[PDB]
Design a protein around this ligand. Structure first.
Ligand SMILES: CC(C)CCC[C@@H](C)[C@H]1CC[C@H]2[C@@H]3CC=C4C[C@@H](OC(=O)CCC(=O)O)CC[C@]4(C)[C@H]3CC[C@]12C
Ligand SMILES: [Ca+2]
Ligand SMILES: [Zn+2]
Lengths: 81, 31, 661, 48
């Protein structure tokens, strides 16, 4: 998704404009995911890391989250595990 | 505060002025 | 999860869309169009919050800013933003969500930026900076401010102190920049301990003040200017003030060190040129004749021989020779040839002790004079002086006990029949401890040598961490000693029941090692060096459980003490030495400067055996300070200005002359 | 309760004509500098 790559660059102007149109992002983890991992595990792992790097963008948290301080606390403990 | 952290050399300000200059010069001979 | 844009910005109107776009471009025809639009109606702000005036200031178009002022837009904090942008023209024109804290004033911000030109401009208007209270001030206003809002109070104090420590402001507005730098550095260093939250900022400010003072000194071009700077009194008064405030880099400057060397080596021209064998021979022959020189000074203080001892190097050599003679005489007391008999309860003084008595009195008088003249506060700073005090106290106690023993006992008696607390035994023990303390004072003479000096200083700085380690080791030792004494105290046996009437671990057969707490502490101390045998954990009653528990506790103590702590200490000492090694030269030079200056004065000329027998000068100083400041300003401008100026002149000159053509 | 700030060592300030000449020199306008120097010769400063 263009938004995911924009959050990788971690800047505000395009992120605000792109998010103005309604945009969703699937959450990461089932039985279906296990089937995909059998077909291609390198692609499956890379996609998950791509999403989490988008979510941990300082610009995205400030613009989308109600409590940016609490969001950084919970995500940091999530990424360490 | 974060903008001043990385936007300090201001090279893209004089570079942007040079870009405007080049656009004007290209327009000149073209017209 | 799709989420939503919780935080956004108000959209710009059509007038707002038209405005700030020509302002970003800055075309003067568009400026006329903006003036026409204003007449049709200016204060609209970009999403960054900056109005037309601020972005015009960024564009650096003085005519645009003047036209905006004519339209009477809100000035707000435009002066502060111009000062922050460090553009002189906009600041001059202005003189003709809030980004900054409310306590910020234009002069404080200018001092923070350390721009000489802008500070000179503002200070021409005679601005003022509020003064700060004492670090420990307890008044109504201070308490009310701290209780009402402590964070704002601390931030305001830090901002004021950071403004006051600007080198440009000190150069412009201080009458004596060097003394101001010294005092400000000392005060900022003292504030870092009280205000633990802002330790780093205050340390950085103190370092900046020290560096400014050193760099101001670095601009002397002749010896006359150096003498004028160093001899100024509000005799080397400025050097003494620098030493008092711990200005190590200022003192260790090569020119000041050269002047100090030419003062210290008086009477010996070309000392450096001489080969080291010649130096050694000269030192030996000068130190050999110390009594003759002392007597000659005592008789004829103004003759050639009398003036010979007044030179600092010769005085130092004579003092060292006298101390070495005292030590050599101390070594002769232990010789059995001195002591005729050892069974006299109260003995009279021998010949060697009679010779040693004048030196002991001389040292006491010298330490009394030092303490009285310097005051109590100055005496404790040395650390070495504590050793002098302890040694003198022990010598006085020895003399008093010897006199008491002479008066009290008047008969001969076998030594094995004497009691434990006989005065003679105590006097002998105190004399031995005094000898140990006296012989260790020779380390303080290592700072005069360029080879053994820095090593001695570095070893001195490494003794602080060892004590911190020893505290933790003491806790561990106390824990294990308490445990072992609790386990083993039931099986205490008397001295009669042991062979040769031994009790303790100073015997060939060690016994009763854990019967008391004091003996347990001594036993655990001696296990670090492997001097405690393994059979001391055995029990005569042969109880297996008790012996097993004792052996396990002893093994655990040994493992913790010798396998973990020692290696940790080795690693810690390795790391500390590497950091210390970097600054060895400056500290050694500071220490040697302190040592040299103590021999410049005329108070302590004689060695220990023989001791007991205003407007014009200110005008010159202000002239020299004027030249140093002018040179310093130009040098620091060079690093900041040349590249920026060349780059600006290139493109700007290229984009306007071609347009005119 | 306040620290007055004032220049201690004062240096004589240049005249307006000398400052204008300095700015013309810095601006790199040869004609302006030539005219200023001609006027200086007429009135009888480059040494400033
Ligand atoms: C070590 C034990 C056996 C005591 C017996 C030796 C002493 C006679 C030595 C040991 C250390 C010596 C001192 C070490 C260093 C100096 C500095 C030295 O100063 C210089 O001339 C320095 C020249 C330079 O900078 O290279 C003068 C002699 C002195 C006081 C020495 C005097 C003689 C001392 C006390
Ligand atoms: Ca002393
Ligand atoms: Zn107060």
């Amino acid at each position: 998704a263009p938004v995911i790559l924009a959050a990788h660059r971690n800047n505000y102007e395009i992120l605000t404009m792109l998010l103005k149109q309604d945009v969703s992002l699937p959450k990461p983890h089932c039985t279906l995911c296990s089937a995909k991992n059998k077909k291609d595990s390198l692609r499956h792992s890379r996609f998950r890391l791509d999403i989490y790097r988008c979510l941990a963008s300082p610009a995205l948290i400030m613009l989308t989250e109600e409590d940016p301080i609490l969001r950084a606390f919970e995500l940091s403990a999530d990424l360490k595990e | 505060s974060m903008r001043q952290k990385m936007q300090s050399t201001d090279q893209a300000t004089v570079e942007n002025l040079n870009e405007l200059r080049q656009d004007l010069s290209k327009f000149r001979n073209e017209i | 999860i799709p989420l939503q844009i919780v935080r956004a910005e108000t959209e710009l109107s059509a007038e707002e869309k038209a405005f700030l776009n020509a302002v970003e471009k800055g075309d003067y025809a568009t400026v006329k169009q903006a003036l026409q639009e204003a007449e049709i109606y200016i204060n609209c702000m970009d999403p960054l919050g900056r109005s037309a005036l601020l972005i015009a200031i960024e564009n650096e178009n003085l005519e645009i800013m003047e036209l905006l002022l004519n339209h009477s837009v809100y000035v707000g904090d435009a002066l502060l933003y111009a000062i922050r942008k460090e553009v002189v023209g906009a600041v001059e024109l202005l003189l003709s969500f809030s980004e900054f804290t409310p306590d910020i004033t234009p002069i404080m911000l200018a001092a923070h930026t350390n721009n000489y030109e802008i500070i000179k401009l503002l200070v021409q208007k005679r601005v003022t900076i509020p003064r700060p209270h004492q670090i420990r001030c307890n008044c109504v206003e201070c308490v009310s401010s701290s209780e009402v809002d402590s964070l704002r109070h601390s931030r305001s104090r830090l901002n004021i102190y950071k403004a006051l420590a600007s080198p440009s402001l000190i150069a412009l507005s201080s009458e004596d920049p060097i003394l101001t730098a010294f005092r400000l550095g000392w005060e900022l260093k003292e504030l870092s301990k009280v205000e633990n939250e802002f330790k780093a900022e205050y340390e950085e400010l103190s370092q900046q003040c020290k560096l400014f003072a050193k760099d101001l000194l670095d601009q002397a071009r002749s010896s006359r200017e150096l003498e004028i700077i160093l001899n100024h009194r509000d005799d080397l008064a400025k050097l003494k003030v620098a030493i008092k405030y711990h200005q190590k880099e200022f003192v260790a400057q090569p020119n000041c060190q050269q002047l100090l060397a030419t003062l210290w080596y008086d009477g010996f021209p070309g000392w450096r040129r001489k080969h080291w064998v010649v130096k050694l021979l000269t030192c030996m022959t000068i130190g050999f004749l110390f009594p003759m020189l002392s007597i000659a000074y005592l008789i004829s203080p103004r003759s050639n021989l009398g003036l010979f001892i007044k030179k600092p190097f010769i005085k130092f050599i004579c003092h060292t020779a006298s101390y070495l003679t005292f030590l050599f005489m101390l070594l002769l007391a232990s010789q059995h040839i001195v002591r005729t008999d050892l069974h006299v309860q109260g003995p009279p003084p021998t010949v060697v002790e009679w010779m040693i008595l004048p030196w002991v009195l001389g040292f006491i008088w010298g330490e009394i004079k030092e303490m009285w003249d310097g005051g109590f506060t100055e005496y404790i700073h040395d650390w070495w002086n504590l050793m002098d005090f302890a040694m003198n106290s022990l010598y006085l106690a020895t003399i008093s006990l010897k006199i008491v023993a002479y008066v009290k006992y008047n008969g001969s008696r076998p030594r094995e029949e004497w009691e434990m607390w006989h005065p003679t035994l105590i006097a002998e023990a105190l004399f031995a401890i005094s000898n140990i303390l006296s012989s260790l004072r020779l380390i303080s003479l290592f700072t005069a040598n360029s080879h053994l000096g820095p090593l001695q200083i570095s070893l001195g700085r490494m003794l602080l961490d060892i004590l911190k380690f020893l505290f933790i080791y003491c806790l561990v030792l106390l824990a294990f000693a308490n445990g072992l004494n609790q386990l083993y105290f039931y099986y205490e046996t008397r001295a009669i029941d042991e062979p040769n009437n031994c009790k303790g671990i100073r015997c060939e057969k060690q016994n009763n090692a854990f019967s008391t707490l004091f003996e347990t502490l001594q036993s655990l101390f001696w296990s670090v060096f492997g001097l405690l045998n393994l059979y001391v954990t055995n029990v005569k009653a042969r109880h297996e459980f008790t012996e097993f528990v004792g052996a396990t506790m002893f093994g655990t103590y040994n493992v913790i003490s010798l396998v973990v702590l020692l290696n940790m200490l080795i690693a810690m000492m390795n790391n500390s030495y590497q950091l210390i090694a970097d600054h060895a030269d400056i500290e050694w030079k500071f220490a040697r400067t302190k040592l040299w200056m103590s021999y410049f004065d005329e108070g302590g000329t004689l060695p220990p055996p023989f001791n007991i027998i205003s407007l014009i000068q200110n005008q010159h100083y202000q002239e020299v300070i004027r030249n140093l400041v002018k040179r310093y300003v130009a040098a620091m401008i060079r690093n900041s200005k040349t590249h920026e100026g060349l780059t600006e002149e290139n493109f700007k000159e290229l984009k306007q002359d071609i347009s005119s053509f | 309760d306040r620290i007055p700030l004032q220049i201690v060592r004062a240096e004589t300030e240049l005249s307006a004509e000398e400052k204008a000449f300095l700015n013309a020199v810095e601006k790199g306008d040869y004609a302006t500098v030539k005219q200023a120097l001609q006027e200086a010769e007429i009135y009888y400063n480059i040494n400033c």
